[PDB]
Design an enzyme around this catalytic site. Structure first.
Site, mmCIF file in Angstrom:
data_model
loop_
_atom_site.group_PDB
_atom_site.id
_atom_site.type_symbol
_atom_site.label_atom_id
_atom_site.label_comp_id
_atom_site.label_asym_id
_atom_site.label_seq_id
_atom_site.Cartn_x
_atom_site.Cartn_y
_atom_site.Cartn_z
ATOM 1 N N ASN A 11 0.829 -1.221 0.000
ATOM 2 C CA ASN A 11 0.000 0.000 0.000
ATOM 3 C C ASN A 11 0.863 1.271 0.000
ATOM 4 O OD1 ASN A 11 -1.991 -1.990 0.289
ATOM 5 N ND2 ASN A 11 -2.521 -1.435 2.395
ATOM 6 N N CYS A 16 2.476 7.766 -2.302
ATOM 7 C CA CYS A 16 1.747 8.446 -3.393
ATOM 8 C C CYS A 16 1.828 7.721 -4.753
ATOM 9 C CB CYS A 16 2.157 9.938 -3.491
ATOM 10 S SG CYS A 16 1.904 10.848 -1.967
ATOM 11 N N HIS A 250 -5.677 9.210 -3.803
ATOM 12 C CA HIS A 250 -5.378 7.809 -4.120
ATOM 13 C C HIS A 250 -4.863 7.660 -5.564
ATOM 14 C CE1 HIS A 250 -5.866 3.546 -3.013
ATOM 15 N NE2 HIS A 250 -6.122 3.353 -4.296
ATOM 16 N N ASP A 267 -4.096 -1.447 -8.564
ATOM 17 C CA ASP A 267 -4.510 -0.693 -7.371
ATOM 18 C C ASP A 267 -3.752 -1.260 -6.168
ATOM 19 O OD1 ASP A 267 -5.872 0.789 -5.379
ATOM 20 O OD2 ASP A 267 -7.865 0.203 -6.050
#
Ligand SMILES: Cc1cc(Cl)cc(-c2ccnc3cc(CN4C(=O)CCC4=O)sc23)c1O[C@@H]1CNC[C@@H]1F
Length: 329
Positions: A11, A16, A250, A267
């Site tokens: 993650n 960023c 995100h 993602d």
């Protein structure tokens, strides 16, 4: 990895846009092969940016579980969230590829960075009513395109090359000739195999406007001279997207790694299949914004996206990275 064939990264948080860039560079296969070849046997485990990029690339190629970037962020000194938000994606990519290019000097994989990413342009200032012309040749590794009031990439490229008049209050200081009416412009001499286009979403007022980019992008009309053996037809490879808040939000990247219109959404840890339209049309914006796009030249596609095998990673590197995984476990 079981569904799509590809693993994701751990993650973001403070990270960023790094994960988006890392997947983009990883699936630039010719670069990946070159990165594995770097003679990093002598390097420091912690401090070496070349070695840390080999580690991510290795793990993206071999892991089933999501790949960590903490050893990599510690290597080039961008640990805090502020350190990512102050910079842009092209600056980060420049930091990684300079390290890579410098390490590749005096090796069998020298010149891979400029082979893949370097194009050339001429900036000129021509005086209208006097005989004076200043020219500078410039290398570029990336282009920053204007999108405010532009429908699409075609229109942004038109604006990028468009001739500016230096009249009235803003006449050109021509030295011995004094202030002169003049025409200022830029022209592309060559476009690289891998074309990095950043879209100017900040003029800092933000621009959420709809901006359209195509799958196939012809750029012969923006060159000074066009080779008929190799036209400048570009094919869409990656689309880097931001959603939500500024000074935050995100970051996602869409990719078709083989270059065959078979798209995936990356993602972070969740890599999943998607439509062309989720990857292209649905990231145009209006009232989610695409901010970087990667195109590959049609003539260079087979070479850039050449198949990687586990044999392409030297045995010495494989043994060193597994020695880390044994000791850390
Ligand atoms: C908050 C934010 C939103 C969007 Cl939608 C894109 C970016 C973004 C991320 C990475 N790379 C680029 C590159 C861009 C193109 N660009 C330039 O190079 C100069 C002005 C500008 O627009 S936008 C962007 C972004 O984060 C940014 C990080 N630093 C400033 C923002 F906070």
């Amino acid at each position: 990895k079981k569904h799509t064939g590809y693993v994701g990264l751990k993650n973001q948080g403070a990270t960023c846009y790094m994960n988006s860039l890392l997947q983009t560079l990883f699936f630039t296969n010719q670069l990946r092969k070159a990165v594995y070849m770097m003679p990093t046997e002598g390097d420091d485990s912690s401090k070496s940016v070349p070695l840390a990029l080999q580690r991510v690339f290795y793990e993206l190629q071999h892991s089933d579980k999501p790949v960590g970037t903490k050893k990599l962020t510690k290597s080039f000194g961008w640990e805090t969230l502020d350190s990512f938000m102050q910079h842009d994606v092209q600056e980060l990519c420049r930091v990684l590829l300079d390290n890579v290019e410098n390490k590749m000097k005096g090796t069998c994989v020298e010149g891979t960075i400029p082979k893949l990413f370097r194009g050339k342009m001429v900036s000129y200032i021509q005086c209208k009513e006097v005989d004076y012309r200043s020219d500078r040749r410039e290398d570029y590794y990336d282009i920053q395109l204007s999108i405010k009031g532009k429908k699409n990439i075609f229109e942004s490229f038109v604006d990028y090359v468009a001739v500016e008049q230096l009249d009235g209050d803003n006449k050109y200081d021509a030295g011995e000739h004094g202030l002169q009416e003049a025409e200022k412009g830029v022209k592309f001499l060559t476009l690289p195999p891998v074309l990095h286009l950043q879209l100017m979403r900040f003029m800092n007022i933000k621009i959420n406007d709809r901006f359209e980019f195509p799958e196939q992008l012809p750029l012969d009309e923006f060159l000074q001279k066009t080779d008929p053996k190799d036209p400048a037809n570009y094919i869409l490879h990656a689309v880097l997207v931001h959603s939500g808040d500024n000074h935050g939000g995100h970051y996602v990247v869409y990719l078709n790694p083989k270059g065959d219109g078979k798209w995936c959404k990356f993602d972070d840890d969740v890599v999943s299949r998607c439509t062309k339209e989720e990857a292209i049309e649905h990231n145009y914006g209006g009232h989610t914004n695409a901010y970087m796009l990667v195109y590959i030249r049609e003539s260079k596609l087979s070479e850039v996206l050449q198949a990687v095998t586990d044999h392409d990673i030297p045995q010495q590197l494989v043994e060193r990275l597994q020695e880390e995984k044994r000791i850390e476990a």
